[PDB]
Design a protein around this ligand. Structure first.
Ligand SMILES: [Ca+2]
Ligand SMILES: [Ca+2]
Ligand SMILES: [Ca+2]
Ligand SMILES: [Ca+2]
Ligand SMILES: [Zn+2]
Length: 316
């Protein structure tokens, strides 16, 4: 809608207070005009028709429990946007400041979130396995990263190419979590997963195996479930990226860590200049090698670490 840019305040899913960019025109809307062509957050009203209604509020104060997921979806999309602009000089997911749109209160008891090709979508969780999924910044940044991947490498969402797609979303979700820097970790979804159990998460990048995901290529899933294990085999790439950044010795193979920012640079470059819709793990290894070479030189420590990290997870 057309209006003046304004600033509201609310409480997010975890009870934390934050400012949000809104637009005023009779009502206050969750429309942030400060970022590209704007960030727009919608109410799906417990149904599955999308997007639903542009979120409208009477007083620009968002402290109702019904408001919390919208507050986080709107705010964390702004954070993710800032990451791509400030760190990789990328304007929104298409690189040309596309409007970023998200719907919350999708369905009833829906324990997931997704990018539907055009927008982000967040369930409320059933209150047991999940609370409202937009509560996790790794989750938001994971979903928005799919839009990024889909406009750039266009990794097809099955088998190894799908695993790569899912891993890139875990990687940049995590890197965005660390960018916002609020007890960040190498875990995925800890903030919105199982409110009754502390310390757990949906997936782990530092220890994929913790949750039964492969941390080495010899252990890859080869069946047909999960589109050929796109959320399972991502663990092999997640561990590679964890190693690249943090270092370690994994199955006897030592890796000298190069830190988070360099991991991001290498993987952003691979994603945007070398990956294709059909790339498999082996081609991912080359893309990352070629990226690090470009960025730091063929004799660098960086290129050396990319090689050992992929050696370590069994990817040749
Ligand atoms: Ca209000
Ligand atoms: Ca965290
Ligand atoms: Ca996390
Ligand atoms: Ca938990
Ligand atoms: Zn995903």
């Amino acid at each position: 809608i057309t209006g003046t840019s304004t600033v509201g305040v609310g409480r997010g899913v975890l009870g934390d207070q934050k400012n949000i960019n809104t637009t005023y025109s009779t009502y206050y809307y969750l429309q942030d005009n400060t970022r590209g062509n704007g960030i727009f957050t919608y109410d799906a009203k417990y149904r599955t028709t999308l997007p639903g209604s542009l979120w409208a509020d009477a007083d620009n104060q968002f402290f109702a429990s019904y408001d919390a997921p919208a507050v986080d979806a709107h705010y964390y999309a702004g954070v993710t946007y800032d990451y791509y602009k400030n760190v990789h000089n990328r304007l929104s997911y298409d690189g040309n400041n596309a409007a970023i749109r998200s719907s919350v209160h999708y369905s009833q008891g829906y324990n997931n979130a997704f990018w539907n090709g055009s927008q982000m979508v967040y369930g409320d969780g059933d209150g047991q396995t999940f609370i409202p999924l937009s509560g996790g910044i790794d989750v938001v940044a994971h979903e928005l990263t799919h839009a990024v991947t889909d406009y750039t490498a266009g990794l097809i969402y099955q088998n190894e190419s799908g695993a790569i797609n899912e891993a890139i979303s875990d990687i940049f979700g995590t890197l965005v979590e660390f960018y916002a820097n609020k007890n960040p970790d190498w875990e995925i979804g800890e903030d919105v997963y199982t409110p009754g159990i502390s310390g757990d998460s949906l997936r782990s990048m530092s220890d994929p195996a913790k949750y039964g995901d492969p941390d080495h290529y010899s252990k890859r899933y080869t069946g047909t479930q999960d589109n050929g294990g796109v959320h399972i085999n991502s663990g092999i790439i997640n561990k590679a990226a964890y190693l690249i950044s943090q270092g370690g010795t994994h199955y006897g193979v030592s890796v000298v860590g190069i830190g988070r920012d360099k991991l991001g640079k290498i993987f952003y470059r691979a994603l945007t200049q070398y990956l294709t819709p059909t790339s498999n793990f082996s081609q991912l290894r080359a893309a990352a090698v070629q990226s690090a070479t470009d960025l730091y030189g063929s004799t660098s420590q960086e290129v050396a670490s990319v090689k050992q990290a992929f050696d370590a997870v069994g990817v040749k």
